[PDB]
Design a protein around this nucleic acid. Sequence first.
DNA 1: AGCAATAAAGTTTCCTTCCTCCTTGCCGATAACGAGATCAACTTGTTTGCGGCG
Lengths: 50, 1340, 402, 157
Amino acid sequence: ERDGLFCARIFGPVKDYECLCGKYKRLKHRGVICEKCGVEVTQTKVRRER
Amino acid sequence: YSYTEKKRIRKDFGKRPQVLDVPYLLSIQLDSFQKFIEQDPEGQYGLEAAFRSVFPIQSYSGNSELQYVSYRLGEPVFDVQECQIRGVTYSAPLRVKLRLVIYEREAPEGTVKDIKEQEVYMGEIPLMTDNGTFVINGTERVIVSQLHRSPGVFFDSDKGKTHSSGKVLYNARIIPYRGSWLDFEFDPKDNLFVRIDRRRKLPATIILRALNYTTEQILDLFFEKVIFEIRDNKLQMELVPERLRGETASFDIEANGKVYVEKGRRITARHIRQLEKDDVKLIEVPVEYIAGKVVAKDYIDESTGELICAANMELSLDLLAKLSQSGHKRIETLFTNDLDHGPYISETLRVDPTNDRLSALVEIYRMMRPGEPPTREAAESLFENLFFSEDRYDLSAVGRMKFNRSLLREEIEGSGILSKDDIIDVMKKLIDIRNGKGEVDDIDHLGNRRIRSVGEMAENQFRVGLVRVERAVKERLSLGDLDTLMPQDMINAKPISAAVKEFFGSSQLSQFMDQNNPLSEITHKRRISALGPGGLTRERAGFEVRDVHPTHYGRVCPIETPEGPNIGLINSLSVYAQTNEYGFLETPYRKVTDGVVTDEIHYLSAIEEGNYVIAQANSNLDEEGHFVEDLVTCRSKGESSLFSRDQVDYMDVSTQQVVSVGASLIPFLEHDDANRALMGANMQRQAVPTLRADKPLVGTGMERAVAVDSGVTAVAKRGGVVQYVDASRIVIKVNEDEMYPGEAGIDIYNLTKYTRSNQNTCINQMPCVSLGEPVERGDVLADGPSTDLGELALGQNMRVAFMPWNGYNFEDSILVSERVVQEDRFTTIHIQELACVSRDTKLGPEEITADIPNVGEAALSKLDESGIVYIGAEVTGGDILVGKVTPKGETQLTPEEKLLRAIFGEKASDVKDSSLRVPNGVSGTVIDVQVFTRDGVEKDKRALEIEEMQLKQAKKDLSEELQILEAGLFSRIRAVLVAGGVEAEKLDKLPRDRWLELGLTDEEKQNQLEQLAEQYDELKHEFEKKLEAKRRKITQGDDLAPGVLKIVKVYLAVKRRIQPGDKMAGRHGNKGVISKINPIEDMPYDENGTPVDIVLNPLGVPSRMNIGQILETHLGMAAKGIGDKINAMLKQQQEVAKLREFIQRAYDLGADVRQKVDLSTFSDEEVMRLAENLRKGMPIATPVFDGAKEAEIKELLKLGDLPTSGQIRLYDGRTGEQFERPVTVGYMYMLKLNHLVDDKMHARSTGSYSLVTQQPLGGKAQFGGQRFGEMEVWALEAYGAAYTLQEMLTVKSDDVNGRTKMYKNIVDGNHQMEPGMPESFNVLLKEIRSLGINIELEDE
Amino acid sequence: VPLDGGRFATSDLNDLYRRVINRNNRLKRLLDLAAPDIIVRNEKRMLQEAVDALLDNGRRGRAITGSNKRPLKSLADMIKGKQGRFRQNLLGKRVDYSGRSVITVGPYLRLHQCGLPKKMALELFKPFIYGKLELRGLATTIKAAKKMVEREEAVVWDILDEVIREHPVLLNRAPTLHRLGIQAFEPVLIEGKAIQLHPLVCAAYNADFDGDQMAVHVPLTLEAQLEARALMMSTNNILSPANGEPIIVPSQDVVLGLYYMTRDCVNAKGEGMVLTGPKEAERLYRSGLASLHARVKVRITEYEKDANGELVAKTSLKDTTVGRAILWMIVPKGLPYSIVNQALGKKAISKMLNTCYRILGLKPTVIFADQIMYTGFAYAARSGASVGIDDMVIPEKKHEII
Amino acid sequence: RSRDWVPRSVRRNAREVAQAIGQLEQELGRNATETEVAERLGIDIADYRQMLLDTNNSQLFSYDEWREEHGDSIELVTDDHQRENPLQQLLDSNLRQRVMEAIETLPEREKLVLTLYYQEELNLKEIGAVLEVGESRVSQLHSQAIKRLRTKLGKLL
DNA sequence: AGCAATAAAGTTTCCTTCCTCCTTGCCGATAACGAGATCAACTTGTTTGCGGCG
Ligand SMILES: [Mg+2]
Ligand SMILES: [Zn+2]
């Protein structure tokens, strides 16, 4: 959950990354253009340990 | 003897006339729970005690009230066996009588307002077996009986606490049974102080005011009045002669007209005699004697009202003048013989700040309730609560009793709440020993320790639940309606059951039981501790409790308690030990009267003995006279010494009463070291029964009683004749006289066959009885796992001769033949149990089904259609048991597995398997399955097959039952038709039902046909009834956790044979490892070609001093010959009279053994069977200290026609030449153990890891890696081999990159290294910064 | 993380973070209203209390617990006591490529040898095997190695024998007091599931053969391999650094053999006859013509290097027991004959060996020791050796004294 | 409500079973005949049968000692399903170069199609858009690549 | 054998879409009961420092 302790939002900082139909999101695949709709996307950065 | 005893007799060499046969051994648990449950009317215990303790409840107003009346229980739904099978606790209903009575609060006590007298169910409770256990959830368990300190009072004195002083400090302590403790103390400065529950120190006297006392009365109580009197100018003073005692004269001590003690002069005992003699108390004295004295009582000017001197204030001569003229010609003061009478209270007072009572309560409150506003009534209520509320305080009049004895009162009993007199008296007793009179006492003295039992635990948890009820009950009484609120509407039964379930499931006392061997259980339930609640702790507790105390004698066995850190703490009960009614101990003793030992008994305490004297049993008694010898070693006062003969009061009974049974059974204890006797009996429980049950030959006498009282076996409930026999069950017919009328009297016994223990072992029973044979009551009818003919059988007797052999017996290691491996006669079985559950997911249900994808049919071949194995199979690691499957969601794959599926193209379902499989390393035989499934669900089909064949079984059993019964009844149903005419065989030939119409006469007999049909109806109705009930109960589904769909469960069977490493030993600490097995042909052998079984290392006889094992060994060789001498005759088939004489003389050897038997009594067939049993060897009883003698060992051996020492010529199997010397040879009876080579071995290359730190685990169960300690580091550093450690810490522990690339390099042949940094390091760094710190590192 | 039945398991840290956050958020909400101050005060009391209790619970104020009545464990005890990373996790290590078993004895062995039951060692040198089965091309890839291996072909055992020669290992009893508690041995595979052990190092390990266990470790790399072959090997580890004594004491048995045989009766036979050498004492006694324990004259050839480290032969005759003659058979060419002319108490053997080392160098001492073991075990078995109730002696002069 | 993180109507139903089961247990005076629960709360069996999961199961903690003094915790008796394994990725990469090995003799676009889609995890029909042939030739050629890789052997099945 | 066409079949998308459900926030209706404690710990123990504590 977001705003949390395991906060998804810190790994997925909201205001972020959704495609139109809602396939790729939440930092999961940084360098993904959602191909069916061909929508290009930016700006995401990853820790797990920090 | 009895039939079972006629089968096989064990000789004895005991000689002392025994008085007693041992009692019922485990009476105690039975008793405790018996009294706990039982409806006591008045002399309450437990449950009624608890109710009548919480005698009724009324409202927050005081308007309405519940009332207790009485209770009752039900009987259980399920029998025992279904409960253990089903997986449930075995429990009883509870049924309560209650009366809701209400008061009219308009009326004064207009009690007729409302009565609702009904009854109430509330909660089940567990009950006990005839054995002792409680099963829970299908798990047999036991709880332990406890020891701890009594309640009451306790005195002590520390010695130089502030060691600078090196001074004593006395103090007293009070411990209610329930409620607050309390502590009274002294200081370095001779002043009294107090604390509750170790609160901070306070002056004592504060509380005295807090109980509405003035200093006047205070020192009136504590202090005797030193009265001066001012007769018109001068000081005269009253004197008791024995006040000036060891004291010296301050002035010219004299009389009105006579001098006794001059200046500077000690008031000797003479002058005390003078002063008592010549009748003087009033003596002129200087006024100056006062100045320094203390006023006793606050003296005033009665006109003013002014404290000229506040009480407890030193005196003077200006104050003398003012006081004298005030109208005080008499001044009480304190006596101060600081030697004896010190004014410690006066001192304690004038340190104390307070005078009024109220502020003292305030300050006590302020300590106890800090910060809170000092509201008056709150302090009063607090104080009354702590010791004067029945709610939160108690004594358990045992406390009251012990206390009154520590008061030296007379009344045993009292209240559960304090009084003022008692408190005053404890202050007095404290100050008196502080002056010196009397003493503090000890802890280890058992007279101060009380035991505590299962019943009480039940009491306390139960009433706790009652209190949980009390809360909301009062909450609702005052408020809700009264007319309509049924008494049961208010209640709940969760919490009660919760506590009950808890400590029957949560306590450190409640444990699994040790199902390994009879001894294990019976001892483990006779096991004592002082741990858990109301007890102690290992690291805190020290040596003083661990050690021995003399009072242990005859109550506690000193010779069984482990090597662990809990050495002396737990210790088992003695044999004839009993408990006082209170929770103390007692032990029987033989009275010694006029020198004669009276044959009576008294179970005497842990206190009483210290007064009297007791005689020892090793004493030789002068045959209806008295103790033969003059200086008899008797004992008293915590020690032993030598006393006369007429002098004695009492005697012990036996020579055994000290020991445990685990201790008692090795014979010839009387010739060996103690510590290893400990080790012997400690491992003696830890054994395993073999496949078969081989006897010993050297005994003590007791094995039968434990063979019985363990309760494993069949028994003769009631005499009879064997009716039906089989390898699985038995039917008996009961003897007529014993067959009481109502039932037809046919007991039956279904037996327990291959069944699993909690230590994972084979359990089973077997007959040692035949068919068409009578039965006496009580005897057994079938053996248990580890016995024979009602006698213990947990090892095997075998040959041995001892000498070195080529370094295969270096340090106690063992060497053996191999023929016994052919015999498989130490081989045993280990049942293993395994399960697999169906569960309902969030998505849907898991399923169980044969069909699964990507499976070779090889697996499936052994499964049925539902996906379940065929019974009887034989299986191995990797094999599959249960085709369980799981409906799954989906995944977002990537091209790797995309393409592997592009290649293989085997479709992924929406399901996976969750199948049950054989664990790696295991292989065995399936022999049984069960399944459990819920009420609500369709029963998976094979489980219906199993319910159907179980119904088949049960139906068959009950059919057998009622068919037999009703067949006995068909006897009547034929015979009574015969009454009233004759159809001699026109009766019989035509079908038997068609007899009712046959020749038929009026008067009484129409009713007889009606009686016939009546019984017919009765019986068929009973049958349908019984089927209905039982078929429902069997068909009744299961009660399950949430989410569960059903479960499967499997058993297994695997059988373990010897490989070296196997641990074994005997009965003298004679441990040993096995290194090698010998072919026969290298075995040392004899004149007659017999090689030996076992070989040994005799260097460790004297160093260990396990010498009695030798004595056995003489006998080990010895009695064998007799059997051979008989079997020789047997195969020769000589004659009965030969057997007769030979046997009688075998029993007629000794001087003065007690048992005396004849056999012209016995029949021929008895001789035949007896001889036929004896062929393997003649067994014997060696009582422990009333044992046999060397005369007698060598007497039997000389009849046996052999070397007297029994040490003889042997030649080598290898080479076939004689050794140098003869060697002693014989048989031992020895054992095997559970520390097995396969149970312990483990290796590990590579596998699982941790997660938070990623280094490996430990445990063979979880594929464990081994640990590498600092000590191993230190050693390595001592060498200085860096790279080892580098590897040890990087790659094989943490560095994951490291482990990977090294694995890579090795399989490439490359034996090289690269390091990194452990993760575990930086974790710490990340903890450090978490704590708010700039930890960091300086780069190179 | 979740459990089998969906249940959870957690870290209490979280719980402490939460209260903090709640209180702070409350405080903001409160502050937006400018509320009366007392609730603010309480808010910050509870704040700092939450804070430090996070750091270290029951230090300042009394501790926070769960429902169990047990503390909500803070940070600091990640670092502390035994439990901390230092004493648990960081210095002490769980290890793979390791194992253990119960042990036992190999008498006949040589010191450097150690018993290995098949399957564990089989498991342990697995990746070597895989490399060599791709080497030979039996296992062209890895799965074939795996599959033939779980099939346990004879070639598997052949290549096992191929590898493990010259492939030493590390041994551990617990607890490690001094540095000899571990040693470095060389394998010998055996058919069981229990290790054999060369008897004499019972003492370096404080071991007794009554059910103890040892573990095994591996110098995977070569550096450590060579160190152990060069440092911890059984040959280096023969004298205490504490005090310069042999730790190779033959304790209890072989001593007995030597004392028994190397002994001078008078009674038996053949008293006072003549021989060339010890080979005739063998010749007779193995035919069984003479008491070994019998002073009789024979001829011996003793050697010496009074020269600058060069031998000096000579010979002469001796009235001596036969065993002394025999035992001269084995002495390696440097000693006098006085060495044997007593019946060999324990320390005689100590000094036997001490002298042997300090003069002759090292390896002859080792060899000497080995044969002492073998032969004394042999003649101990020959010995005839047992005790009885009759070997117990009671002086008649006890009862009167009492 | 703030501290708890489970829904509300959940606890309504929990309170309801509590009231009901106690009410009816006193009506009867004995226990555990759930069909009665199905009756009195006559909505369905499966509803409560789920609810018991939903409600009657709460969380626990991680470091509780393992019972018979402190031999180990629950943190040492834990298992995982999502583990690393070294040879599957090894042989997957092996098969990757086997893919290019197989297809390098086959048509130029499909070579690049399957390379750049399978290698660097890029776009498939991006290429179908490049050629504009309808991706039927794609279809049969992809089939052929499978037929080409079904000419060799590999376990890990 | 390589190349395309027509027809069929199965889709994945995917997007709405309107039913239904479900969850986040708020505000309300009779009148007054009592400052907590509540179920524990059993005092390890010797050494060493520091604040008093004169
Ligand atoms: Mg040992
Ligand atoms: Zn999209």
